[PDB]
């Protein structure tokens, strides 16, 4: 392994500097023999993934917080973690020397770095792009005689997707999602961007709009690429739109068409929006017998805020409609833009990513996804002048790239948790401040994650019936991961 090189820009924490012919590296996780346990620690003073070991005692007579582990509950199962790719990231990665290009790819996928699982591919012309285009633009052609792909799709995305799968040891899945429609299809041009196809389902307009997906999939699958799922529409409500139109669209023409096609193993999610309206939005669609044979799950958004209660909406839906999986489509950054667009090396923005992934997993939600991969120092190239922040920043003139504290906060959860491990259950004895979650690996080993957000140290002890007791201590502003192996 090789150590890291710090550098301070004038904030609470520091960042790491990587240039051609140098970088930092890790080692594969290690399981010690019976009788011992291993611990990985990170904090604010400057430690990054430090490893230590210790013994497991036989009997303990002390009094204090005790977290009792009950392996007789099963709960849910875990799918994976991933990220999304756009035009801005593909443009900002390719403008570097080839070794610097290889190092970035090896940092995300190979076993020397954290492990990623999912990729998201927008259909066409996202917000982070220089121009605006669609796949079909010839007016008055009900049959899609003309369907083409641009210079950007065949030279800036496909090569990178092809290269990503060569440096991986885990399965990789893919996704898709639409944004808008061609101008002539829109019956009325109400406003810029999103509009509305005036009419009723079953006319030629909706039938023509329902043949976009099959064409896109069969055109994209000529380069040995296949997908796993699909989404109806992003941001369905144009802020200024009825849970009654969706039920009839999905029911009449969209569903029947996909099954008849050669692609029949592609699933279909239902909603891609906020959660405030979750309890009502389902009760109109799911109760219909015609439109209940096609849905295979629900997707929800997170806005990095916890003021809205999570027990009234997210925790209540699972009671009425079991056997319907939940998925977090995108951890949409608020992008309030009132503060500075990018601050280099800030600890406070790191806590919000971890507190969300620990809150979500407690309410039967499985899966997680981000927005972007790399951005320029000011903010990504945007068409409407809106800016956001990303884990890794890239500077071209000096040929250097930089990391941030959110990288390790994501790596704590992502690296050690495979796909297909349950949640067993943990019970505390007194009210505390810490946050913790317990999971069991498929083989039978265990893993525990502990998070603290205060300025006081706490002593703690964990008891397991099979092997014994283990004691430790947790300082302020730090995050810990414990591993141990059962007989």
């Amino acid at each position, epitope marked *: 392994a090789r150590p890291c090189i710090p550098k301070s820009f004038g904030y609470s924490s520091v960042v790491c500097v990587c240039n051609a012919t140098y970088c930092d590296s890790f080692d594969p996780p290690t399981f010690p023999a019976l009788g011992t346990f291993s611990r990985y620690e990170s904090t604010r003073s400057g430690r990054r993934m430090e490893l230590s070991m210790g013994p497991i005692q036989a009997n303990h007579t002390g009094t204090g917080l005790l977290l009792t582990l009950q392996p007789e509950q099963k709960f849910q199962k875990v799918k994976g973690f991933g990220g999304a790719m756009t035009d801005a990231a593909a443009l900002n990665i390719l403008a570097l020397s080839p070794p610097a290009q290889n190092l970035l790819l090896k940092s995300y996928f190979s076993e020397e770095g954290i492990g990623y699982n999912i990729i998201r591919v927008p259909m066409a012309s996202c917000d982070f792009s220089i121009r605006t285009y669609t796949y079909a633009d010839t007016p008055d052609d009900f049959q899609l005689h003309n369907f083409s792909l641009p210079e950007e799709d065949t030279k800036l995305k496909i090569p990178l997707i092809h290269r990503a799968l060569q440096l991986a040891q885990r*399965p990789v899945s*893919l996704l898709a999602s639409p944004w808008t429609s061609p101008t002539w299809l829109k019956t009325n041009g109400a406003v810029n961007g999103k509009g509305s196809l005036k009419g009723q389902p079953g006319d030629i307009y909706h039938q023509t709009w329902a043949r976009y997906f099959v064409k896109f999939l069969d055109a994209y699958a000529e380069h040995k*690429l296949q997908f*796993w799922a699909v989404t109806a529409e992003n941001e369905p409500s144009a802020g200024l739109f009825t849970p009654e139109h969706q039920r009839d669209f999905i029911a009449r023409d969209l569903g029947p068409t996909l099954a008849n096609s050669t692609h029949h*193993n592609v699933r279909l999610l239902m909603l891609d929006d906020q959660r405030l309206l979750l309890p009502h939005w389902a009760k109109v669609v799911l109760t219909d017998p015609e439109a209940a044979k096609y849905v295979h799950g629900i997707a929800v958004h997170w806005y990095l805020d916890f003021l809205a209660p999570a027990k009234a909406t997210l925790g209540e839906t699972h009671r009425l409609f079991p056997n319907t999986m939940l998925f977090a489509s995108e951890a949409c950054v608020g992008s309030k833009f009132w503060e500075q667009s990018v601050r280099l090396g800030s600890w406070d923005r790191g806590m919000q990513y971890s507190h969300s992934i620990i809150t979500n997993l407690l309410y039967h939600v499985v899966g997680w996804t981000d927005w972007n991969l790399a951005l320029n120092p000011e903010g990504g190239p945007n068409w409407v002048r809106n800016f956001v922040d990303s884990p890794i920043i890239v500077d071209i003139t000096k040929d250097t790239f930089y990391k941030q504290p959110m990288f390790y906060h994501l790596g704590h959860f992502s690296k050690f948790i495979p796909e297909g491990s349950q949640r067993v259950g943990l019970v505390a004895s007194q009210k505390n401040d810490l946050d913790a979650v317990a999971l069991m690996h498929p083989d039978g080993s265990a893993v525990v994650v502990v998070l603290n957000r205060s300025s006081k140290d706490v002593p703690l002890t964990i008891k397991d019936p099979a092997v014994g007791f283990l004691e430790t201590i947790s300082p302020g502003y730090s995050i810990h991961t414990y591993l141990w192996r059962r007989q």
Partner: nanobody
Amino acid sequence: QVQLVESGGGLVQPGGSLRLSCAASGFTLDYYAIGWFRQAPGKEREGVSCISSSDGSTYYADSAKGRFTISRDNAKNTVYLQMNSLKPEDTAVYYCATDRGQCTYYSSGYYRDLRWYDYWGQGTQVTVPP
């Protein structure tokens, strides 16, 4: 070492439902995703069915969307297939394998990938007049 015992292969009188049986031991079946495969001499490797242990699924080949039927039995740790109609050409070796993911041949990034499958077993072949 895990034993992948294949049974039930053979010829039957026309008008009957053939049934294959894959038996496994040395591991807990609830955490393994088993999937039947089919190959013929001088032919591209193909698949027939796949079942996921984590969550129920019935992934099927385009050749027969419903003719086939998959089933499992945790009491005997044995998986079975159900045959409905005999295609003229159904002469090929059938293998019982394993997987480190949930049905990678039908739900992965690359078209028809076969790297993950390991712990392969012997194959059984039955012949139907075309």
